Amino acid sequence: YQTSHKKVRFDEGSYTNFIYDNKSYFVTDKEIPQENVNNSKVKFYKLLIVDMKSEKLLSSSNKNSVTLVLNNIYEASDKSLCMGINDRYYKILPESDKGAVKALRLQNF
């Protein structure tokens, strides 16, 4: 008997966002080095494409668009959470942190 794992709910067909532990959360532009990562957190497979033109979701991959993979969550040494995106781990913060922090940027890809 061992209970310790919650399924992450992604917005789907939308920008970077998700809810964990009944709490709103999103992917930030802040990236954390593997050396800071403690270990795996959650295993999921999600991929989508967004156009940098209007920052909207699409159905195909164009030159004016960039693919984004929101998944592969990991833990940090400071109990911080992060998600894997394009071989790059980006820290995740609650939507309540808005005002001073914003979602990640596709320019990093």
Side-chain angles (χ1 to χ4, degrees), residues 2-108:
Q2 46 140 76
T3 29
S4 24
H5 227 114
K6 292 212 102 232
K7 171 261 269 177
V8 187
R9 181 204 149 190
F10 313 114
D11 209 336
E12 222 197 85
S14 230
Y15 232 77
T16 49
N17 184 54
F18 82 90
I19 301 171
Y20 169 87
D21 192 36
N22 322 297
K23 294 138 87 96
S24 267
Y25 265 94
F26 72 95
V27 188
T28 74
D29 79 90
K30 276 71 170 120
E31 183 197 304
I32 277 63
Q34 70 192 118
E35 61 230 41
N36 271 238
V37 185
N38 194 103
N39 79 133
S40 81
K41 210 211 182 288
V42 176
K43 254 197 221 298
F44 258 118
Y45 214 141
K46 208 300 204 310
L47 191 151
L48 38 64
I49 313 177
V50 191
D51 213 291
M52 311 193 61
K53 286 282 258 250
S54 296
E55 305 167 32
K56 299 304 299 194
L57 259 287
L58 305 183
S59 272
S60 33
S61 209
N62 45 292
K63 294 204 184 154
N64 308 349
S65 185
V66 178
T67 197
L68 312 161
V69 191
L70 311 321
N71 77 137
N72 234 225
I73 311 186
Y74 292 77
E75 208 154 273
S77 190
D78 280 329
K79 314 302 189 232
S80 320
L81 313 321
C82 69
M83 195 171 299
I85 310 177
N86 276 257
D87 314 290
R88 299 183 173 197
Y89 316 136
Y90 289 102
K91 221 171 125 216
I92 54 193
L93 277 296
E95 75 178 354
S96 301
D97 244 306
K98 277 275 145 157
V101 59
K102 297 199 183 140
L104 86 90
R105 298 193 212 81
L106 323 107
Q107 305 192 327
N108 317 325

